[PDB]
Amino acid sequence: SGFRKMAFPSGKVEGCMVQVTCGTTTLNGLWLDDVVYCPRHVICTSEDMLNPNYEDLLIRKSNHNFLVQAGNVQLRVIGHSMQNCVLKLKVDTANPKTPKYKFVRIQPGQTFSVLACYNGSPSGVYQCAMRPNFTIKGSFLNGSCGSVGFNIDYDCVSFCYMHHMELPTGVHAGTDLEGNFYGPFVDRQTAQAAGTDTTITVNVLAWLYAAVINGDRWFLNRFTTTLNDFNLVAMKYNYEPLTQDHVDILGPLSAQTGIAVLDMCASLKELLQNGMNGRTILGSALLEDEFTPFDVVRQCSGVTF
């Protein structure tokens, strides 16, 4: 019983965090086997970001220009290259704490845990959703670049995010570990701002199920609706349209609660139309959309096994 915004245990990623310094510029790197990965704008100064020529700035530095430091031991760089917006430093020692890992690209609507770091030292861990507009509402301070997002499944860490930037609204942007940004953002000092966002409908439904498993049932009605009927109200409240694939994904929770998906959509329809009657759902006065159907199962389906 109980449902909280829960991050994955962070031990496996902590032992991979290092500090990268190139000149007066420092940030965080991820040390996996004999390579350190980090945002390429560590090779820049403040003035370089007016118009950075990364191909050129890279050729001009050599291995000795990079100081990598894991805890206090200096790691010796013996190679450097660039893949998209990520820098890769080969080092002479392989990380003995390297977990089983994969590089994945997450989709909008999906969640991950962020391990926020400064000067190579983890400071906090929390859970984020990739917004429909390819930003994340993180908590980051100066020097957090290179902090990573991940999921764990079995004993395998899937790295999906590396932190590069804060945009004007104070939301955050970054890349996958291949160095491709999520969203239409770039590592240069030029005008950028997050586009229009929408509410993640399948996640709002998963969260209402979590409530029910935990005994919150006031919002339930006896009503039901059609997928088409539901998607007309969804549009009126900036909710993205519900697909049959999303209905399938909700299978496990509908099974556990005995409430069919289109039944829970009728409940959600009434909440959007008539409000939350000054009541709370799992401790929130707002409809929450940063929990995936899998995030509910992980924390809630244990009673069913």
Ligand X SMILES: *CC(=O)[C@H](CCCNC(N)=O)NC(=O)[C@H](Cc1ccccc1)NC(=O)[C@@H](Cc1ccccc1)NC(=O)CCOCC#C
Q: Any idea which residues carry the catalytic annotation?
A: 41, 145
Cα angle 216, 217, 218 (rounded to 5 degrees) comes to: 105
Q: Is 11 in the site for its own copies (CB under 8 A)?
A: yes
Question: Quick check: helix, strand or coil at residue 229?
Answer: helix
| SS3 of residue 176 by DSSP | coil
**C-alpha separations of 7 from 44, 117, 258, 295 in Å:** 33, 15, 28, 10
123 contact choice in ligand X, its own copies, none (CB below 5 to 8 Å, kind-dependent): its own copies
Structure tokens at 116: 């926020």
Report yes or no: 281 and 217 within 8 Å, Cβ to Cβ.
no
CB closer to its own copies, 8 vs 66: 8
Among 203, 292, 276, 293, smallest CA distance to 240 is for 203
Residue 189 binding partner per list ligand X, its own copies, none, with a CB distance cut-off of 5 to 8 Å that depends on partner kind: ligand X
CB 88 within 8 A of CB 268: no
- Which residues, numbered 85-104, are part of the site for its own copies (CB under 8 A)? none
Residue 138 binds: one of its own copies, ligand X, none (C-beta under 5 to 8 A by kind): its own copies
Ramachandran region of residue 276, left (φ > 0), alpha (ψ -120 to 50) or beta?
alpha
Among 25, 214, 225, 231, binds its own copies (CB under 8 A): 214
Q: How many CA atoms lie within 13 Å of 175's alpha carbon, on the beta-carbon side? A: 21
Contact partner at residue 41 from ligand X, its own copies, none, CB < 5 to 8 Å by partner kind: ligand X
- Closest to its own copies by CB, 81 vs 284, is 284
Nearer to its own copies, 230 or 239 (CB): 239
Pattern 110-139, its own copies, x by CB under 8 A: -----xx-x---xxxxx-x--------xxx
Residue 285 near its own copies by CB under 8 A:
yes
Name the residues that contact its own copies, by CB under 8 A: 1-12, 14-15, 115-116, 118, 122-126, 128, 137-142, 166, 170-172, 214-215, 280, 283-286, 298-299, 302-303
